[PDB]
Write an enzyme that holds these catalytic residues in place. Sequence first.
Site, PDB file in Angstrom:
ATOM      1  N   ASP A 184     -17.888  16.406  31.953  1.00  0.00           N
ATOM      2  CA  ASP A 184     -16.587  16.998  31.629  1.00  0.00           C
ATOM      3  C   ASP A 184     -16.590  18.541  31.789  1.00  0.00           C
ATOM      4  O   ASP A 184     -15.530  19.159  31.644  1.00  0.00           O
ATOM      5  CB  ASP A 184     -16.117  16.619  30.213  1.00  0.00           C
ATOM      6  CG  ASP A 184     -17.007  17.148  29.118  1.00  0.00           C
ATOM      7  OD1 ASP A 184     -18.231  17.150  29.310  1.00  0.00           O
ATOM      8  OD2 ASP A 184     -16.473  17.553  28.051  1.00  0.00           O
ATOM      9  N   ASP A 334     -23.443 -26.135  11.211  1.00  0.00           N
ATOM     10  CA  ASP A 334     -23.944 -27.526  11.358  1.00  0.00           C
ATOM     11  C   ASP A 334     -24.938 -27.870  10.210  1.00  0.00           C
ATOM     12  O   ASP A 334     -24.573 -27.613   9.049  1.00  0.00           O
ATOM     13  CB  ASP A 334     -24.517 -27.718  12.798  1.00  0.00           C
ATOM     14  CG  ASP A 334     -24.954 -29.162  13.073  1.00  0.00           C
ATOM     15  OD1 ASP A 334     -24.068 -30.006  13.313  1.00  0.00           O
ATOM     16  OD2 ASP A 334     -26.199 -29.446  13.015  1.00  0.00           O
ATOM     17  N   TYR A 465     -32.018 -35.392   9.702  1.00  0.00           N
ATOM     18  CA  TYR A 465     -31.062 -36.510   9.542  1.00  0.00           C
ATOM     19  C   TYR A 465     -31.646 -37.730   8.815  1.00  0.00           C
ATOM     20  O   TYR A 465     -30.911 -38.687   8.550  1.00  0.00           O
ATOM     21  CB  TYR A 465     -30.642 -37.018  10.940  1.00  0.00           C
ATOM     22  CG  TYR A 465     -29.768 -36.081  11.722  1.00  0.00           C
ATOM     23  CD1 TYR A 465     -28.386 -36.110  11.591  1.00  0.00           C
ATOM     24  CD2 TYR A 465     -30.321 -35.154  12.586  1.00  0.00           C
ATOM     25  CE1 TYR A 465     -27.577 -35.240  12.319  1.00  0.00           C
ATOM     26  CE2 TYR A 465     -29.529 -34.299  13.327  1.00  0.00           C
ATOM     27  CZ  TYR A 465     -28.162 -34.355  13.209  1.00  0.00           C
ATOM     28  OH  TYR A 465     -27.444 -33.505  14.009  1.00  0.00           O
ATOM     29  N   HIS A 523     -17.931 -27.588  19.151  1.00  0.00           N
ATOM     30  CA  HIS A 523     -18.989 -27.616  18.133  1.00  0.00           C
ATOM     31  C   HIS A 523     -19.856 -26.369  18.156  1.00  0.00           C
ATOM     32  O   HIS A 523     -20.327 -25.962  17.088  1.00  0.00           O
ATOM     33  CB  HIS A 523     -19.886 -28.858  18.320  1.00  0.00           C
ATOM     34  CG  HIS A 523     -20.976 -28.961  17.288  1.00  0.00           C
ATOM     35  ND1 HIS A 523     -20.682 -29.276  15.969  1.00  0.00           N
ATOM     36  CD2 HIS A 523     -22.313 -28.734  17.400  1.00  0.00           C
ATOM     37  CE1 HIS A 523     -21.843 -29.232  15.317  1.00  0.00           C
ATOM     38  NE2 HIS A 523     -22.856 -28.942  16.141  1.00  0.00           N
TER      39      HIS A 523
END
Length: 546
Positions: A184, A334, A465, A523
């Site tokens: 600049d 989850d 699970y 998901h």
Amino acid sequence: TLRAAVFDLDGVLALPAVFGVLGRTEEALALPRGLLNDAFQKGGPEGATTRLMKGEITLSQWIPLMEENCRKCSETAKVCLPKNFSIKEIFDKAISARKINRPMLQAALMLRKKGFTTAILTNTWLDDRAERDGLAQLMCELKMHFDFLIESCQVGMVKPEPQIYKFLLDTLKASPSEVVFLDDIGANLKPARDLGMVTILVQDTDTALKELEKVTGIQLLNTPAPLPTSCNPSDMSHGYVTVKPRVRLHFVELGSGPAVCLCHGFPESWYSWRYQIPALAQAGYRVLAMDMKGYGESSAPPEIEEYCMEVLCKEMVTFLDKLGLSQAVFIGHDWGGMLVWYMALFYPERVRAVASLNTPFIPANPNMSPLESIKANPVFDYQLYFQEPGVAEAELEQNLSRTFKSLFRASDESVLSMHKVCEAGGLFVNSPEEPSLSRMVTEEEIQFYVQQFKKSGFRGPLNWYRNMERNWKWACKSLGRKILIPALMVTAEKDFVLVPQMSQHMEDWIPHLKRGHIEDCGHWTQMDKPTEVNQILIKWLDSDAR
Ligand code: NA
């Protein structure tokens, strides 16, 4: 021919320019035009500001020299500076107001993505002010996006001296005609043009980017919204805590501030939070992204009962104890989301706040076996397929690339329906051998998951699970409780297993619950809509977790 882009900091990568405060202060105080700018550059190459920029002295040592220069300039102009005139106050406010110029940063990132070597080259100082942390944070955020950062006070050379330009070219390993240089200040651009560099004088960002686009031939303006910053695994801090003999949890850690523990689902990794980790750290949090038990670099014992919720939660309490953390915010997705609700129910004293992506909190029904509840919902048939030890492990481990490419897909790309899995004979029986790559993941990202799962495979992960009865007996102990600490439930419109409607009664048990909802999201919430997840989480953390 161009293959390198160099950007100045003040007025190019960060705005409003600090240097512009001299003119703004002169106008606000009705001082003679240029008075403060003349005091700033007083003495030229031999003056106080050049000594500061070369690192000979620090900012705090320079502040009284600048003040003396202001008085010598005001005396020659025959004017008087105000009673409470403070260079430190002026510079403190200007540095604090100066923020990253997001379109300029976006353009530098795009050029780097297209093979350019990028660098920041700046005349700057050794900041020892009491408020120096603010600029240290800004520099940390900026520098991570560039190949090189060259600061005048480190190298002992300043623009516009010729040596700093030759130092830059040596650093870039490039000839001057292969470099675009953006600045600049016209005087600081001049030496680069003399060497043969392509130069851009930056006033307004939009015109500078039009010039940059034309000279590089790369689209930089009007581009699609980019993804949030991701994680490079080899650039992260990796932590390891032994929670019991034979069980060691791995995590990635980034940031400072309140601890936020991210808990992934099945079959994922700490890397599933790759878009959230940089964002939450930048937002002012200390992020701990876990490899959950059974995954990645964490231990994966073979016994099913090592993965029941009671054991997993006790281990996460031990993890906080070994790290010396009295609390953490827990955010899960989850199976990780199921875990964080039970951390809130059984260990509220250790949970600063709790958030779940997709997984609702539904109290256990003490009059029905979890087996019968699972059988009642057709979309939960894959859970019955996962029950028999060895069956799902053999299918999921047979070809890891096929497994992750089949699983990690957006809502409009499916190859797997989570219903009729047992009758079909497996998750992938009606799926291609070489699935197409989802728009959510690159081949390199899939290969990271593949390498992580080579260590322990799917036995540990599937064992999450295989404790439905054990988890149900433990959850029934909490039925008289409510979750009264700060909580957030985030639903995903197109998750067809963990559907938003399943979360509809949560306020009965979490009366102060806050919500978020993501449209057109499947998901894999974190990688499907990362920008939206980051916005929702940071808004919630800032209002409820500080
Ligand atoms: Na079936």
